Amino acid sequence: SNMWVIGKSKAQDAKAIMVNGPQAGWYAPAYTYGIGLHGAGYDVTGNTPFAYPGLVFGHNGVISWGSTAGFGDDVDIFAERLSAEKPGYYLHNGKWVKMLSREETITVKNGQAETFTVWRTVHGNILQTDQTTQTAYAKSRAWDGKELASLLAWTHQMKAKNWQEWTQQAAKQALTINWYYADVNGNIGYVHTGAYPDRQSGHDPRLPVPGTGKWDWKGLLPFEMNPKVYNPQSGYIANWNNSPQKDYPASDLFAFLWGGADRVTEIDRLLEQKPRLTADQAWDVIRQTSRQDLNLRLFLPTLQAATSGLTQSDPRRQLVETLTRWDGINLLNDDGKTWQQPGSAILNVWLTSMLKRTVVAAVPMPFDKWYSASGYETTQDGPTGSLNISVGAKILYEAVQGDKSPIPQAVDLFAGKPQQEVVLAALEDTWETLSKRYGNNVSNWKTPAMALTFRANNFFGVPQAAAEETRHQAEYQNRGTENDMIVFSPTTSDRPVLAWDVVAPGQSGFIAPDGTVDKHYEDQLKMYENFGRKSLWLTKQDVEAHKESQEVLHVQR
C-alpha cells in the first residue's frame, strides 16, 4: 500500500494533498465501505475496510488521515520448554507454569464435527508447526491485549483537530501501521505507529528466543521511539511499505527487506521532479506508479555497463538498448491483451536467470527457493496483490552496487566471475528464450500484459460472493485496491477542502433473491479502470445537494 502527502511548500493551488492507496488485493464486493458519520462528536467522510467503526481513509473537514502497512517487527517467537512428564505445562522463571487451553469444535456442513485444543502461554498462542516432546513455539505480539484499543484509536482519531490531538490517538494504535496526517492549514505528518517490544540486550529480533524467562521482553517501547515527522523539510511524505526512518528495523520475514532497492523511490522521483504539484498531478502519480516496471531503474545501469563494449549486431546489446529507450511505463496494445513494449518480459527473464546464477546459487537448499522469484510471477487472473521488487532482486541489487552498497558481501554472489560476464550470460538466456518464442524482430514482440481480477473470495480465500460475481479488468495496475485523495484549502473551490475516492466495484454488494443487482453494485468499476474518481461529500449542504435517498429511524436503546 502506498501514500504520498504533499505539504504547503510543495502543493500547487492548495495547501496540502493526501493520496492513499491501500493494497490488499481486489475483491467483489469492494474491499472497502463508503461511510459518512455526523454526530456524537464525529463529522467525517471516507471509506474503510470491512466497514470498521473507524475510517482508515477519510477526513473531517479540518484534518485528513490514511494508512499503509508498517511492516515493523512487532512479533517475536519464544521457544518454550516442555516436559513429557508435565503435559500442559512449560518452564518459565524456574517454575512449571500451566498453559492456557480451550476446546474448540469445528462444525462442518455435510461433514463430521471436529474437536481440538488450542494452547497458549505467557508469550502467546502455541504454534502447530515445529513441535517436539521437548519444544513448542509461542508467537508473541507486542500488540497482544491491545486489539480493541487499536480499533478505538482508529475511531477516536477521526475527532482530532490538530497534530497533538491526533498523535494522542496514534499513540494508542498498537498494530504496526503507518499513519499519516494532513490539515486545512497545509500541515502534514507521519507516524509509524504500533506497539514495539523493549528487547533484552543481545536479543536478535530476527530469530527465536528461549521462553524460559531470561529473554522475556522488558516491556514496550514508548511513543517517543515511534518514527514520526511533522512538516518535514522535504515538503512531502511518501511511503510504499518502505522504511519509516534511518536505522529503523524491518519485519523479520525472510522475504521482506528495506534496502537500496525500494519501490517507494518511484514515488519520491515523481514528487521531486516538480517543485509543486496540483491535485490532478498528485492523483496522476497513481496512474504512473501503477504502470511503472519496478526493476528497470534498479538494473539498467548494470545492463548498460555490461553491454557498453559490444557491437550493434549483438542481440544482448539490442535488448539493453530496447530497455534504455523505455520509460518502463507499461501500456496495453489495442488488443487489450499485450504490452506495447517488451521490457518487463526482458527484465523478467533476465532477472530470473541472474538470481538463479547468483543468490540462488549461494544459498543451500531448500532455502534457495526463497530467492528465485523475479517478482513478475503471476497467474492467468493476474496478481493477487501489489507488485514489488523481489527479495532476491533486492539482495542482487546490493551485489551489483559493489562498494556503493553498505551491506558487506560476506560471500560473492558472482563466485569470482566478473559481474559483466554473468550479466552477459543472462542476457544471452533472455534473447534465446524470448527470440525463440516471439521471433528475432523485437519491434513486433507482443508480450502478455498482466490483467486484474476482482475476486469473489476475500483475502482469506473465503467466498464473500458467488463465483460468477468475479469481475475482470484488462489492465493490471499496481495501485491501491481503493484510492482516495483529500485536498486542503483548494484555491479553485468554495470549500476549505475537497475529497474524492473510488470504491470498485461499487458501494453495494446486494443482489435481491430474484438476482436483481443493486443500482450501486457496479457503478464504480469503469471509473476504477480509467483512473477516475468521484466526490466525497462532508457538509450537510453537500450531502443534501447530492442526495439520492433518505430514511429516518426512530429507536430507543
Place this chain on the structure above:
Amino acid sequence: SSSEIKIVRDEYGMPHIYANDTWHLFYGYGYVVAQDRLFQMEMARRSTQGTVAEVLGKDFVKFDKDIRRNYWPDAIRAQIAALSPEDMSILQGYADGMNAWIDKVNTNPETLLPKQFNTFGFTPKRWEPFDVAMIFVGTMANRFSDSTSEIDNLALLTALKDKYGVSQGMAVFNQLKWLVNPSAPTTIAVQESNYPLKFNQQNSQT
C-alpha cells in the same frame, strides 16, 4: 429527537448517518452496512472466527482450525468488558443496527434476503459486539500485523553456518536478511531524525 437516526445516501449509494449520541450513530452505521454488504460481512465474520466450514464444508476445516489457533477469544471478550460505556456504545450500537436490518431480512426474505444466502444454503444471524470487534481484529491485526518467520529464519542461518562455517555463516545471514540497511529509502529524511535503537545481529540469544 434523541432517538432519531437519519440516513442519507448520495449519488453513489454512499451512506451518511446523522445521530445525536454514540449508540445511535453506530446503529445507523451498522444498519446501512447490513443493507449493503450483509453476505460480505457474514462471510468475513466466519473468516475471522473460523466458522466457515459450518456453511461451506470440509474444504475449510483446516482454514477454520488455523484461525481459531491464531487468537484467544476470551482475551478479546475481556477487552470488550473493560470498555467504558461510551466506547462500548460504538460496538454495541454497530451490532444492534445490523440486527435491526437482519430482523427485517429474516421477516421478509422473499424480497430482502441477499441471493447468496439462498445460493450457499443458509440465513444470517444476529451480531454481538464481539463479532464486530473481530472483523477488525481478524483482518487488521491477526492478518496484517502478525508477520514473522523467525523459525524459518533460524533454519536458514543454521544451514548457512553449516555451509560457510559459523563466522561466515552469520555474516551471510546478515547479507541476505540484514537487520538494517542504511541505503534504504526512508519516508523520513535523515536530516529529520534517525531511530536510536541498535539491535543484536549475532543471534546472541544462543
